[PDB]
């Protein structure tokens, strides 16, 4: 029973490595769109006023 | 025929000053000038909001940090209750 434990986690350990890697870009790297959300939201405006 | 020219003068008589020309209006007793071009004018943004969404307050984003860059009291104690969750899990 102790062989398939010990064998549940032998190729999980190092594939979590590039799993924790990316999972942190993927999650911290949303902050170029912000700035261009910051942009889109000054192009409505812009767009508003005008068609006002 | 003269009938239509005369009316056709009658629009370069009554409205000529009217928006033809800036000679206000003679049939109205209230005036032309001051309602449209300087009290309309900010009539659209009378209606909308001004200093704030016409001027668009082009505003700097607001930063947002990280985690405080303050790893070593809180990955530890995660780890150690890495411990605690994998004894759960």
């Known amino acids: 029973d102790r062989i398939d434990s010990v064998s549940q986690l032998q190729n999980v350990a190092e594939t979590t490595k590039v799993l924790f890697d990316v999972s942190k870009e993927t999650v911290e790297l949303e902050s170029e769109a912000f700035e261009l959300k910051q942009k889109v939201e000054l192009a409505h405006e812009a767009k508003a006023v005008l068609d006002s | 025929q003269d009938l239509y020219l005369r009316e056709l003068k009658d629009t370069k008589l009554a409205p000529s000053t009217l928006q033809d020309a800036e000679g206000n209006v003679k049939p109205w007793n209230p005036p032309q000038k001051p309602n449209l071009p300087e ?10 909001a001004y200093t704030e969404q016409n001027v668009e307050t082009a505003h700097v984003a607001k930063e947002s940090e990280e985690g405080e860059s303050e790893p070593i009291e809180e990955d530890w104690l995660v780890l150690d209750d890495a411990e605690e969750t994998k004894e759960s899990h």
């Not at chain 2, 009290?39 to 909308?48: D, S, W």
């Open chain 2, 39 to 48: 009290l309309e004018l900010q009539g659209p943004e009378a209606l909308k």
